[PDB]
Amino acid sequence: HHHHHHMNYARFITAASAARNPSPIRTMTDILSRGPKSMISLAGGLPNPNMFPFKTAVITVENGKTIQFGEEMMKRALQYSPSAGIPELLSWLKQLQIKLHNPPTIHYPPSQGQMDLCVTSGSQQGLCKVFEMIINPGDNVLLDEPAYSGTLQSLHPLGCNIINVASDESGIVPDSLRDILSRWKPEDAKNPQKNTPKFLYTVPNGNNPTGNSLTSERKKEIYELARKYDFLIIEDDPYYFLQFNKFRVPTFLSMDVDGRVIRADSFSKIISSGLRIGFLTGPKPLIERVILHIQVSTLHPSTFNQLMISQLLHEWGEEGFMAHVDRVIDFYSNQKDAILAAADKWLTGLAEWHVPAAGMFLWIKVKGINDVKELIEEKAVKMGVLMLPGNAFYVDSSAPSPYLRASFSSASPEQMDVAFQVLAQLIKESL
Amino acid sequence: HHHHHHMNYARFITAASAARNPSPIRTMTDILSRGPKSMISLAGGLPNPNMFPFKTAVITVENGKTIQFGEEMMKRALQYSPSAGIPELLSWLKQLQIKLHNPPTIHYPPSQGQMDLCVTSGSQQGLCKVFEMIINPGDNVLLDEPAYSGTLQSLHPLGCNIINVASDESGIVPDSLRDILSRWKPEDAKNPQKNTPKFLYTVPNGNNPTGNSLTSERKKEIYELARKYDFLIIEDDPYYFLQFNKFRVPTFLSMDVDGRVIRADSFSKIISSGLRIGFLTGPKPLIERVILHIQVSTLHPSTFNQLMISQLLHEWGEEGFMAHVDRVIDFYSNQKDAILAAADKWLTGLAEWHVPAAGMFLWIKVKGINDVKELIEEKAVKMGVLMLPGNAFYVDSSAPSPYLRASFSSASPEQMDVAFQVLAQLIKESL
């Protein structure tokens, strides 16, 4: 018997989200193409692209072929395109997801969670619209702190109760999640008044700010709890392609037999943050709610920027894409080694840290102080150094934090050495 | 005494919108630049742009200088940028708004509505976030039908009561608005339980689908009603730069002594729809709520696409921008003349229409039929022609509509002649 549980997606969709109806720009593109080519439509609502002033583009690529938009491709790049993304980018990304994650839901019926993808204007846009789709005021949601400050700022106005799940150097601790969920009975998920959690959100690789990643065994245990208590998992994975380990841990999407995982991927850290391109992968009924919200907001991701990325990826193939990933990992892993060496030299005895598993941040706990912000934004700024106090990564940002987040994306080894010399002095003269 | 009334912006901001707090990507950009240049920050959260694969760009321009992104500019184009837009585009657009509209609010205190601008990922994103900022379920809002289908689809899930204001060939009819508002007393606006309308929304030039535009005298009367009953005006003006008249009618923004107008502009019809660039202009406290929502969603408009537009506009200057506008008007006005000639020839006696004042649509009322959709999507599609039934432009899209929207953005005169021959035959053989 094929594995996986029946889902009722209506439990995870607000009344406003369910009320949305389709609003594409001129759906006649289907009735015209299949019909006669001599079919004259005065029914469309597209501006004439011959008026647009940019005419051709040439974009050079390191380790890839030059990208050229000739006259006709430029007119396409400068015109509206489908809400979920251009078809050639969607098709390539779907094949990538199948290669990397082989999701169980690929061939499910739509109504029981068939895998669907949506290109978004950055991954964070997809996450925001997912949160907005699900959360009514008073709903309970689960996540591990410290968390990305932007996620916390997105959730705050929605009025949900954020329930912290304990975490350590291997991510969320399943025993903590199990203990929290024992507040409910599993059947309470079928009774709205009981207010069982709607979802668990986590960054499973290279959490910002901690650098920690989940293990495979913990992901399996967490997934089983999500099935038992019938909550969704929001897998926000922007550092998926920045793991230092040779082998990537299987994702929640890869084990999602039920159709309860919404995954966010991004090329923001590896290909371009400024182009505003990410993508959601998840069950069709939930992805459809996000698409409909896009249709009345941004309409679509930039057609031009999608064509840039799509042409890059098609020429690279999976091989060239993974080779690029491996160059970027190599660079960040060397930066990681450099910042750890500077910490070993100058901060030993004064602070403690875990080795980042992925991403671009080192999370430093200063010993013998209750709050860092004293010796950073008032003392380190006078000595020529700035690192980020940890307070902003908690729901309660006023509580004291002895943590600093240090970035290793760009500093040279010399800059890291100086920076940690200064920090060591500050810690010393503050004890 | 300087003209304009005290505003209380809290009356137009939902609890969720007011709850938002600032969430920029690493605000340390200010403490670093003014500080010493030898200040080492490990506090930022930017990915290293040297990893990104695109290295230079060359973009040709008709009637303008070729745009070049060299190595350093490309790294900027591929990186995160500020939520409200890049500074050089904001500054140029602010000067444009001052030139075109000379808004009264330029030098007001922030708290009483100082003019502020936000570049958005298309104008519709700004409008969506404005609607979301204002509307609680059950709130009353005012607009004229027929209206852009996307606006209606955006408002539907928010649960507002849409109150139709009568409109004719000169836009909203002020006597209708006055009669509707007589349901309330002006002081009811200071009593939430009375549920006075929160805003009036309109497309004042070249309404989609009608082609009609407001007159100056009506705008003044409408503005006075907005002051008297204390509602905002949402001026959605994507065809502002596509007016066929030599002189543009003054905008609501140009008369906004109170700070009660939120204006949406777009370059989607004139420079590029696919680049997803528009902008809001409005009172600082309201624009700030939109920016904060952007900060947790799209983060910013594509940096690359903003640099393309900004470099185009700076090289053109106001003179080159207006010259481009005038070429585009010339083209669309000729298309307008062509579709009117085809209507004169083939549809006279069978339909009636008003001459479009702006934009790219002709709105045709078929005589002697209650609903068109019979003779379009089941009869015209077999004869090689498609035009858009008017039903989608009303809140009640199931009510019969004898109207068709015909686009003149692209068809040749020959295609228009054929299309209207067919439509004339269909009307004839359906009576």
CATH number at residue A387: 3.90.1150.10
Which pairing describes strands B232-236 and B261-266: parallel, antiparallel, or unpaired? parallel
Q: Is B394 exposed, middle or buried (0-12, 13-18, 19+ CB in 10 A)?
A: middle
Q: What is the dihedral of CA A69, A71, A75, A81, to 10 degrees?
A: -40
| Distance in angstroms (rounded) separating the CA atoms of residues A282 and B25 | 27
DSSP run (H or E) holding A142:
strand A140-143
Q: How far is CA A61 from the centre of its chain?
A: 25
> How close A73 comes to chain B (CA, Å)?
12
User: In this structure, how many other beta carbons lie within 10 angstroms of the beta carbon of residue B21?
Assistant: 13
A343 touches A337 (CB < 8 A): no
- CB-nearest to B39 from A150, A327, A384 is A384
B123 touches B266 (CB < 8 A): yes
Which residue type occupies A149?
S
Q: Are residues A293 and A198 in the same domain?
A: yes
Q: Residue B361, SS3?
A: strand
B118 touches B294 (CB < 8 A): yes
Q: Give phi and psi for A119, each to the nearest 5.
A: -70, 135
* A405 has binding-site annotation: yes
| Distance in angstroms (rounded) separating the CA atoms of residues B406 and A41 | 8
B298 touches A126 (CB < 8 A): no
DSSP A128-196: HHHHHHHPPTT-EEEE-SS--HHHHHHHGGGT-EEEE--EETTEE-HHHHHHHHTTS-GGGGG-GGG--
Q: Are residues A32 and A149 in the same domain?
A: no
**Gyration radius of chain B's alpha carbons:** 24
* A108 has binding-site annotation: no
Q: Which residue does chain B place closest to A62, by CA atoms?
A: B53
| Distance in angstroms (rounded) separating the CA atoms of residues A325 and B275 | 27
| Distance in angstroms (rounded) separating the CA atoms of residues A165 and A154 | 18
Q: Which residue does chain B place closest to A296, by CA atoms?
A: B154
The number of C-alpha atoms within 13 Å of A12 and in the hemisphere containing its C-beta is 28
B285 touches B9 (CB < 8 A): yes
Best probe of the A interface among B26, B40, B69, B155, by most A CBs < 10 A, is B40
Best probe of the A interface among B34, B74, B240, B296, by most A CBs < 10 A, is B296
User: In this structure, how many other beta carbons lie within 10 angstroms of the beta carbon of residue B15?
Assistant: 10
- On chain A, the residues whose CB falls within 8 A of the CB of B28 are 386, 388
Ramachandran region, residue A85 (left: φ > 0; alpha: ψ -120 to 50; beta: rest): left
Peptide bond into B146 cis (omega under 30): yes
Q: Residue A422, SS3?
A: helix
Q: Residue A243, SS3?
A: strand
CA distances from A404 to A361, A363, A386, A393, B276 (A): 10, 6, 10, 10, 37
Which residue type occupies A265?
D
Tokens of B84: 């409200």
Beta bridge partners of A60: B56
| Distance in angstroms (rounded) separating the CA atoms of residues B283 and B260 | 7
Q: Are residues A152 and A231 in the same domain?
A: yes
Max CA distance (Å), chain B = 83
Contact check, Cβ <8 Å, A384/B300: no
Token pair 């002006």 in the structure block, residue = B186
**Could you give the number of structural domains in chain A?**
3
Nearest Cα residue to B129 out of B13, B50, B43? B13
Q: Are residues B238 and B302 in the same domain?
A: yes
| Distance in angstroms (rounded) separating the CA atoms of residues B87 and B104 | 22
Q: Are residues A44 and A73 in the same domain?
A: yes
| Distance in angstroms (rounded) separating the CA atoms of residues B118 and B277 | 10
| Distance in angstroms (rounded) separating the CA atoms of residues B292 and B285 | 11
| Distance in angstroms (rounded) separating the CA atoms of residues B419 and B427 | 12
Contact check, Cβ <8 Å, A297/B43: no
Tokens of B46: 């930017």
Angle at the Cα of B325 from the Cα atoms of B390 and B220, rounded to 5 degrees: 65
Which one of B41, B59, B78 terminates a domain? B78
Interface contacts A/B by beta carbons within 8 Å: 327
Q: Are residues A144 and A293 in the same domain?
A: yes
**B294-325: string of b/e by CB count within 10 Å (b at 16+)?**
bbbbbbbbbbbbbbbbbbbbeebeeebbeebb
Which pairing describes strands B67-69 and B54-61: parallel, antiparallel, or unpaired? antiparallel
Token pair 């060359």 in the structure block, residue = B58
Q: Residue A236, SS3?
A: strand
Contact check, Cβ <8 Å, A79/B304: no
> How close A109 comes to chain B (CA, Å)?
27
- CATH number of the domain bearing residue B152: 3.40.640.10
CA distances from B161 to A86, B121, B195, B198 (A): 36, 27, 10, 11
Which residue type occupies A250?
P
- CB-nearest to A296 from B21, B150, B415 is B150
Q: How far is CA B202 from the centre of its chain?
A: 9
Q: Give phi and psi for B89, each to the nearest 5.
A: -75, -45
Could you write out the three-class secondary structure of B196-258?
CCCEEEECCCCCCCCCCCCCHHHHHHHHHHHHHHCCEEEEECCCHHHECCCCCCCCCHHHCCC
Ramachandran region, residue A75 (left: φ > 0; alpha: ψ -120 to 50; beta: rest): alpha
| Distance in angstroms (rounded) separating the CA atoms of residues A113 and A258 | 8
Edge-to-edge strand list for the sheet holding B403-407: B351-353, B361-366, B403-407, B388-389
Look at the alpha carbons of A304, A306, A312, A315 in this order and tell me if their dihedral is positive or negative: negative
- On chain B, the residues whose CB falls within 8 A of the CB of A361 are 45
Contact check, Cβ <8 Å, B386/A55: no
Q: Residue B200, SS3?
A: strand
- CB-nearest to B41 from A124, A327, A386 is A386
* B208 has binding-site annotation: yes
Best probe of the B interface among A297, A360, A364, by most B CBs < 10 A, is A297
Q: Are residues B188 and B287 in the same domain?
A: yes
Q: Are residues A422 and A385 in the same domain?
A: yes
Q: Residue B70, SS3?
A: coil
> How close A356 comes to chain B (CA, Å)?
15
- What is the extent of the structural domain holding A200? 79-316
Q: Residue A248, SS3?
A: coil
| Distance in angstroms (rounded) separating the CA atoms of residues A366 and A349 | 9
- On chain A, the residues whose CB falls within 8 A of the CB of B21 are 153, 156
Q: Are residues B83 and B163 in the same domain?
A: yes
Which one of B60, B78, B96 terminates a domain? B78
Q: Are residues B311 and B321 in the same domain?
A: no
DSSP run (H or E) holding B27:
none
Which residue type occupies A61?
V
Method: X-ray
* A178 has binding-site annotation: no
Token pair 């975490």 in the structure block, residue = A167
Q: Are residues B84 and B183 in the same domain?
A: yes
Nearest Cα residue to B22 out of A194, A43, A296, A149? A149
B394 touches B145 (CB < 8 A): yes
Which one of A248, A281, A316 terminates a domain? A316
> How close B223 comes to chain A (CA, Å)?
27
Q: At what angle do helices A413-428 and A303-346 cross, to 10 degrees?
A: 50
DSSP run (H or E) holding A112:
none
Edge-to-edge strand list for the sheet holding B67-69: A67-69, A54-61, B54-61, B67-69
Angle at the Cα of B292 from the Cα atoms of B288 and B296, rounded to 5 degrees: 165
Q: Are residues B108 and B36 in the same domain?
A: no
**Gyration radius of chain A's alpha carbons:** 24
Q: Which residue does chain B place closest to A320, by CA atoms?
A: B53
Kindly give, in sequence order, each residue whose CB lies less than 8 Å from that of residue B356, ignoring residues fewer than 6 positions away.
B206, B211, B212, B244, B336, B362, B363
> How close B344 comes to chain A (CA, Å)?
16
| Distance in angstroms (rounded) separating the CA atoms of residues B289 and B83 | 12
Tokens of A326: 């491996």
CA distances from A324 to A116, A244, A316, A336 (A): 26, 14, 9, 18
Q: Give phi and psi for B140, each to the nearest 5.
A: -95, 135
Contact check, Cβ <8 Å, A53/B271: yes
Tokens of B386: 């498609």
Please tell me what resolution, in angstroms, this structure has: 1.5
* B148 has binding-site annotation: yes
Which residue type occupies A210?
T
**B144-162: string of b/e by CB count within 10 Å (b at 16+)?**
bbbbbbbbbbbbbbbebeb
Q: Is B31 exposed, middle or buried (0-12, 13-18, 19+ CB in 10 A)?
A: middle
**DSSP E strand stretches across B107-174:** 115-120, 140-143, 161-164, 167-168, 171-172
Contact check, Cβ <8 Å, A61/B78: no
Tokens of A102: 């082989």
Which residue type occupies B17?
S
Ramachandran region, residue A423 (left: φ > 0; alpha: ψ -120 to 50; beta: rest): alpha
> How close A238 comes to chain B (CA, Å)?
11
